[PDB]
Amino acid sequence: MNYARFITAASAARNPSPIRTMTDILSRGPKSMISLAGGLPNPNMFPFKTAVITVENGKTIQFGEEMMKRALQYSPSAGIPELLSWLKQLQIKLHNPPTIHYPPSQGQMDLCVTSGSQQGLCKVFEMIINPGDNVLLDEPAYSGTLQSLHPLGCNIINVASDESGIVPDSLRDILSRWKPEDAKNPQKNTPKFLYTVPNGNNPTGNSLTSERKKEIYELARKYDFLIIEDDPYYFLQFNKFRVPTFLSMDVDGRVIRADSFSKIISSGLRIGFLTGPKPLIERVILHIQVSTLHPSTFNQLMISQLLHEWGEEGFMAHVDRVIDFYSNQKDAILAAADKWLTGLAEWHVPAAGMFLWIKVKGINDVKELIEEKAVKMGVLMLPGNAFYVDSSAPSPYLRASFSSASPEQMDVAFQVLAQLIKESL
Amino acid sequence: MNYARFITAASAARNPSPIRTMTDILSRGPKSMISLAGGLPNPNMFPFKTAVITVENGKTIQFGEEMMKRALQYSPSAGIPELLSWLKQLQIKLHNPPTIHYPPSQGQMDLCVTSGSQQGLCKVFEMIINPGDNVLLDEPAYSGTLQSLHPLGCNIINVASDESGIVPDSLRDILSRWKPEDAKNPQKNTPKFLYTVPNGNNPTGNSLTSERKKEIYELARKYDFLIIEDDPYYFLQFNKFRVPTFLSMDVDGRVIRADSFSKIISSGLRIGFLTGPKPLIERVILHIQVSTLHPSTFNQLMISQLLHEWGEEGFMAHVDRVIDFYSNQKDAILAAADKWLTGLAEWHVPAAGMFLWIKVKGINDVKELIEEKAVKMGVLMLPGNAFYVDSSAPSPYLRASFSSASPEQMDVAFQVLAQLIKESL
Numbered sequence: 001m002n003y004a005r006f007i008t009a010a011s012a013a014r015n016p017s018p019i020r021t022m023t024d025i026l027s028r029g030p031k032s033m034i035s036l037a038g039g040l041p042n043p044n045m046f047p048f049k050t051a052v053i054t055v056e057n058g059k060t061i062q063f064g065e066e067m068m069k070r071a072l073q074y075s076p077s078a079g080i081p082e083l084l085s086w087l088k089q090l091q092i093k094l095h096n097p098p099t100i101h102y103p104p105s106q107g108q109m110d111l112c113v114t115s116g117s118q119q120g121l122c123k124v125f126e127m128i129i130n131p132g133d134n135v136l137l138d139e140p141a142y143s144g145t146l147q148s149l150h151p152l153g154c155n156i157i158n159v160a161s162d163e164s165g166i167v168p169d170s171l172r173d174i175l176s177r178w179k180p181e182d183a184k185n186p187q188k189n190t191p192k193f194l195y196t197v198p199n200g201n202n203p204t205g206n207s208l209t210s211e212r213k214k215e216i217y218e219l220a221r222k223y224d225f226l227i228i229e230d231d232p233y234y235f236l237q238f239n240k241f242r243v244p245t246f247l248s249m250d251v252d253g254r255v256i257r258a259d260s261f262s263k264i265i266s267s268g269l270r271i272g273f274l275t276g277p278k279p280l281i282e283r284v285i286l287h288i289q290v291s292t293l294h295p296s297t298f299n300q301l302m303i304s305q306l307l308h309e310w311g312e313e314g315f316m317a318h319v320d321r322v323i324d325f326y327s328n329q330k331d332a333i334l335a336a337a338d339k340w341l342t343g344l345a346e347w348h349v350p351a352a353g354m355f356l357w358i359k360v361k362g363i364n365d366v367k368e369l370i371e372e373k374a375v376k377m378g379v380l381m382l383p384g385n386a387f388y389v390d391s392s393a394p395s396p397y398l399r400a401s402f403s404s405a406s407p408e409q410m411d412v413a414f415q416v417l418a419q420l421i422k423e424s425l
Numbered sequence: 426m427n428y429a430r431f432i433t434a435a436s437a438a439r440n441p442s443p444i445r446t447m448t449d450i451l452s453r454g455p456k457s458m459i460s461l462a463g464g465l466p467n468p469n470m471f472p473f474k475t476a477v478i479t480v481e482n483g484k485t486i487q488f489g490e491e492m493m494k495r496a497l498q499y500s501p502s503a504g505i506p507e508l509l510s511w512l513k514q515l516q517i518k519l520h521n522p523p524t525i526h527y528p529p530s531q532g533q534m535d536l537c538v539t540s541g542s543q544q545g546l547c548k549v550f551e552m553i554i555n556p557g558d559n560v561l562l563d564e565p566a567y568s569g570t571l572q573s574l575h576p577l578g579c580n581i582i583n584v585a586s587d588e589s590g591i592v593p594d595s596l597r598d599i600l601s602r603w604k605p606e607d608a609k610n611p612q613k614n615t616p617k618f619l620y621t622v623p624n625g626n627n628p629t630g631n632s633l634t635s636e637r638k639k640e641i642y643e644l645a646r647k648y649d650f651l652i653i654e655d656d657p658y659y660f661l662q663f664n665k666f667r668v669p670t671f672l673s674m675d676v677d678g679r680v681i682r683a684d685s686f687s688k689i690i691s692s693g694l695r696i697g698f699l700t701g702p703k704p705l706i707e708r709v710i711l712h713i714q715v716s717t718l719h720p721s722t723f724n725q726l727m728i729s730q731l732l733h734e735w736g737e738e739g740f741m742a743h744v745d746r747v748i749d750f751y752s753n754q755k756d757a758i759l760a761a762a763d764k765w766l767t768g769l770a771e772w773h774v775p776a777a778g779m780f781l782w783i784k785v786k787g788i789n790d791v792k793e794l795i796e797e798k799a800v801k802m803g804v805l806m807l808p809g810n811a812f813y814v815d816s817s818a819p820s821p822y823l824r825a826s827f828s829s830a831s832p833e834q835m836d837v838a839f840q841v842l843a844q845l846i847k848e849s850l
């Protein structure tokens with residue numbers, strides 16, 4: 001409702017930046033208009049001329065001469081228009097966000113293609129956080145989020161979580177420290193936002209439920225904080241039905257959502273996108289305009305043509321192929337865990353994503369059990385310390401990836417792990 | 426010599442971020458080592474499988490199965506190793522920087538590939554600037570640089586410039602506001618850095634001279650400030666011998682240089698690179714680690730393989746073709762201007778780049794002459810207002826691009842402008 005509350009002075013001071021009134025007054029005027037006003041380098045000097053890219057379960061992608069010149073040239077900061085248009089329709093299909101037809105100033109849905117979803121998240125954090133601001137999230141969390149938040153000088157307030165994600169009663173108790181009207185009085189610093197990964201949290205593998213999302217949203221309205229929905233595993237849910245998203249229930253216009261193709265189409269191409277209230281997305285776009293300028297035009301065209309040939313049906317058929325693969329990998333690593341972790345450890349079934357989160361019994365810290373004893377036995381799993389704000393505290397947890405390993409490799413790996421737990425007790 | 430002086434609290438607080446101890450303890454240990462510690466998604470689900478990219482004056486570039494899988498997956502934040510090593514050798518060949526073998530803490534030359542050179546520049550500004558800080562640069566300046574600096578709250582101090590770039594006497598006079606020893610006393614805020622585009626300034630087309638660079642460098646030592654050498658037109662100089670760069674005379678380790686392939690190889694692939702003192706480059710790398718993560722692996726491999734097949738010889742042959750083209754366009758737009766600007770305007774001959782800077786005589790502000798009268802006559806050139814800190818002040822200057830226009834188009838465009846000037850005198 002009042003987005004200025006969530007925008008630092010620096011972010012608010014931004015104004016629009018280059019490649020401006022050159023390819024828009026010429027993108028509608030007569031074909032006889034000469035423009036020596038543009039800052040674009042002549043693409044005929046560029047040495048790549050054509051491209052052919054083969055696709056599994058899809059038409060081969062071809063960049064002819066003119067399409068290649070476009071791919072090698074600057075493009076809009078928010079993304080190329082045909083990709084933004086497809087993605088917007090996808091978001092309407094998947095989430096029917098309440099904000100689609102709101103006035104801009106009151107949170108009309110808006111999209112920005114980013115150079116990876118993490119770029120969008122970083123610029124969102126920078127847009128909002130003043131030193132000393134309070135922010136809410138569940139630990140353990142993606143180490144990259146914690147390392148992004150650390151230098152911004154916010155107080156991270158841990159919200160309790162279990163196998164169903166954030167626990168609303170913990171969030172409610174935390175918020176009781178304030179009165180709601182304090183959100184209109186910045187003197188005692190009500191939380192600016194809540195961040196969470198609602199599906200297949202890295203490292204736990206846990207997902208939020210529909211009912212807790214609703215509860216959490218009512219509290220976000222009551223104390224007027226934003227929800228940053230970081231959902232890179234959204235297209236990797238193993239349940240029959242995808243849980244409704246925060247975006248899908250965002251009647252106020254207080255959700256900023258991050259999507260990624262990093263886990264399902266390509267991480268190396270650095271393509272993700274933000275969906276959120278237009279006034280906040282605009283502040284991110286202005287920062288992009290003085291930073292990366294835009295995501296790679298070449299990589300956007302690769303993905304846009306892939307998606308447009310697939311149609312929504314072919315895209316969703318791809319995600320079902322990826323769901324099939326990761327859920328079978330999940331079944332395999334759970335079988336190896338049941339097999340070898342013998343009442344030596346505890347774990348919850350991952351609801352989505354690509355990680356299994358193992359609590360080792362009878363040991364207070366495992367990073368000495370792994371980085372010393374396990375490495376020379378030819379096995380490595382990631383100690384859980386790195387996923388907490390205080391990464392020096394002891395952690396009995398290990399994060400095990402099931403994205404790649406064969407059942408044979410899982411059997412050997414959990415064999416070795418079992419031996420190292422027993423001889424350490 | 427004291428780099429902490431040039432690093433903000435936030436920037437200094439950054440710690441090294443993900444994709445860490447997984448592909449380095451496995452990149453040297455035995456191949457019998459199993460790792461479930463890694464976080465990488467399975468590239469076999471990614472739908473692009475092979476690529477063939479044709480090159481003009483070059484061997485076609487082929488991404489086979491394994492190369493494509495690498496192209497589609499995460500890679501190091503500073504860039505892929507073979508691109509970094511090639512570029513490092515290029516910088517040694519072009520600039521022979523005095524810092525190559527310095528100890529890290531006193532400015533050992535280091536490089537970062539960035540997602541466009543502007544990303545590296547932006548993160549350099551963010552690394553350095555506290556609100557209230559004083560910075561030096563010459564106006565008119567790239568509008569993207571002015572829009573980047575404005576929200577950081579620094580006081581921009583304009584240094585005088587002429588057809589030979591920054592005037593050293595002007596820089597010396599401005600600095601006489603402080604005593605040299607004031608640089609070791611942050612209380613009265615000596616300038617943190619001087620920023621300049623030394624070759625083919627956008628919008629003026631002017632370039633610095635060797636003698637002036639040496640003078641400027643001496644002042645940067647005397648008053649102990651950094652030089653940010655933003656040099657995107659370095660490979661578009663019309664002379665036979667390139668002017669030595671600030672980097673080439675940087676015996677103190679106080680130069681941060683930005684290079685770009687945007688103007689000669691591809692703007693759309695978003696590839697640039699920073700060269701500078703290792704302590705400062707490292708701060709930028711850590712910001713990339715929580716932001717874009719890395720430049721497109723696919724696009725880095727395209728460029729890297731092209732560069733490795735060309736060798737430095739093939740690369741320099743390419744730049745000389747492009748110089749030749751742009752120098753002929755320059756000759757052409759100067760002819761048009763001689764022909765139809767009849768003592769109606771003044772201009773200097775551009776020394777590099779792709780722009781001509783035209784001062785209309787007898788008119789105080791041209792943006793009404795262009796955005797109103799010229800548009801309906803079918804001709805567009807860019808008013809100079811956008812290239813100054815105060816973009817509301819009147820400007821008699823126009824920027825005209827000679828990157829693309831045919832001689833016929835130039836002849837028409839300047840005929841129209843001439844008529845408008847004459848009937849607008």
Ligand SMILES: O=C(O)[C@@H](Cc1ccccc1)N1C(=O)c2cc(Cl)c(Cl)cc2C1=O
Pocket residue numbers: 142143144202263354382386443444445446447463464465466499718
């Ligand atoms: O680069 C990234 O964004 C991802 C890649 C990824 C892909 C699929 C599933 C999960 C992550 N990534 C992590 O989140 C992560 C955490 C830690 Cl603790 C380490 Cl040590 C390394 C990484 C990492 O590469």
